[PDB]
Give the backbone structure.
Amino acid sequence: EKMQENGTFDVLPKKEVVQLKKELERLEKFLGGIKDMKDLPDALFIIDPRKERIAVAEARKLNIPIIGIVDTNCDPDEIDVVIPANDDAIRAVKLLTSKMADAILEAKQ
Amino acid sequence: KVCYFTSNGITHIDYKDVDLLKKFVSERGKILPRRVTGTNAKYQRKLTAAIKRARQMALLPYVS
Amino acid sequence: RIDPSKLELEERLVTVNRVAKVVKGGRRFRFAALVVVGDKNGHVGFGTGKAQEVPEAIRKAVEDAKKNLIEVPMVGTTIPHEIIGRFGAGNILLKPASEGTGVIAGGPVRAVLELAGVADILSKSLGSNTPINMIRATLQGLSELKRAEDVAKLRGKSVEELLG
RNA sequence: GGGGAACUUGAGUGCAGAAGAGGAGAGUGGAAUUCCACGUGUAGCGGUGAAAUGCGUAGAGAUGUGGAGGAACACCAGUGGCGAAGGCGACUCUCUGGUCUGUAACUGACGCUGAGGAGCGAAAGCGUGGGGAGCGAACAGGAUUAGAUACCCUGGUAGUCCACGCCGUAAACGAUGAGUGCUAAGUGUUAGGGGGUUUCCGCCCCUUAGUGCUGCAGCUAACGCAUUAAGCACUCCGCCUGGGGAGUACGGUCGCAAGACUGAAACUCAAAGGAAUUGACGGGGGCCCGCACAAGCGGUGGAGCAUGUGGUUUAAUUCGAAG
RNA sequence: GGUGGUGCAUGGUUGUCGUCAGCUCGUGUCGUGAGAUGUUGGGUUAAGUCCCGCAACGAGCGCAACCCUUGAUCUUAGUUG
């Protein structure tokens, strides 16, 4: 991103299009807004481990207590913090993420 | 589908009921299968208990 | 829990296996490795070692060793009681004894118990003579050990009442 | 362990139901194959990778009616029913076994397993007669092929079929010896039973019994197995101790015989097998490629001659390269 | 000194599968282990070409490209042309 606005932007008019900006569309999606991490975190919040056991496995494998809204078919042996609620209610998944984001918001002092 | 017998809740076929039997017989005379008719297993086994007998009294055709 | 890497690991190897794979041209000889890793103060572990060379497999054994360690009770430089581990067709039992009895164990197993610090074990490899599973026959039994003060806390009972 | 006395859950009995291709018996049909009688009718049908042998102007094949006779019992048919297993599917009757539910009326542990012993046990085969339409080992013929004592081909004997007697073996398989309890579910499906609104139909829930599939813990060497265990426990019976030699020899029983059951050894190899993985192959599949093939052009193999190795030839025919 | 011997002692050097679309590594896991994933699935291409999906994310040797030739034109330079 230093290259496209500050660095050497004038190489080809299509080297950036085929390669560089095609990279920019991928990594801003697939590596997204976790990009400023520089650390191994000690928590994780997910929505459906029964859909997505794959992400939980290495988090379990490094002894990391995580949180998460779970479905009734999920794994309480896996997760330390059980939150049983509607997995697909758009208000409730906004509601439960609002309380937890405001939990750490008040904990900034 | 719907069992024809449980719609009546009916017991013994009373073999002379040929028009009741002819609903369960195909065009040329063969036995209509269970899963198309959607009968019950107790009822389907009474059908061939009944249909075969009326074949031997010429009230149901073998091959027409 | 997970044992931390804030220890003094001693990490002497056991065996090396050259291990093949058959391609269009011919074979491909690589090497296998496994290194028992620990201190002499009750922490034992290992990892696999896979490479295309001899010494880089020795390196990568230490990684999963530091990923997977396990702790053993050292009551009087013995195992505190008698146990028989049964992981995967290699049975290796474990018997405690008095303190003069030394380390009588199998070939790879003798490079485990000295990497515990525990110097008083009688044992006998009942099962197969394969180096990975005999080490799996040890730590699985060593995982199922118990401490004297711990089970009295489990029973809600006196520790000396377990002795008298 | 033994004796004396009680309890009813184990198991059994009564009673009230329900399911059934469970067995044995005498009889009953309906298409279809062939056979034969005949009408009608003409050159072939018959059969294969291709074709022939077989059948045919004496009238086949096709077709119409009629007749004998056997055996098989479509449709229903379904990881559907039932039996302990082998097994049993047209129909009806006579005779007969167990199964499961409902409780509670009864018995008061009466039960489980079971070496030898007993009986059953598909198909083949055996002995005596019955019956033999298809089908069909042996054999024969025509092809196929270098060979065809085979696959194909048209026939074709025993057989299968029945009553009665015997052999008593099979991948007689869930490759899982029988019983008792216990251990997440979800799911159909066969027979019930209980309820919840409902006469209903129905939906829902509880519940016994086999019946299948996907699944947790645990078991497993891996595949897999998972309330129908290969989980954890226990009672009883059989079997194994490397592979071949070998289920052979010998000895004995049994049988009408064929051979079954019990069952070795000298010898000899350092291994034979178990699942799994990467590969390579397949007269296994799916995608896909190159003048590979097809669609074309022009040559090589004939002719002389140049040239290159063969062999052979010589004093040596320098040595190397060999799809 | 050997054109003496052995290319189954060898360096080096080239053919060959074929200019075929492939061969692996690092980390992560997966499986007691061998290995497996990445490279497979979907859509394309001359191509592991490239996109999407994907318990894998990446990188390396390859493919192609930058190299020449020929195919157009301009600048500069016109003799022995």
User: Anything to note?
Assistant: The first helix of chain B runs from residue 4 to 8. Helices of chain B lie at 4-8, 18-22, 34-37, 41-55. The two ends of chain B are 27 Å apart (CA to CA). Chains B and C do not touch (no CB pair under 8 Å).
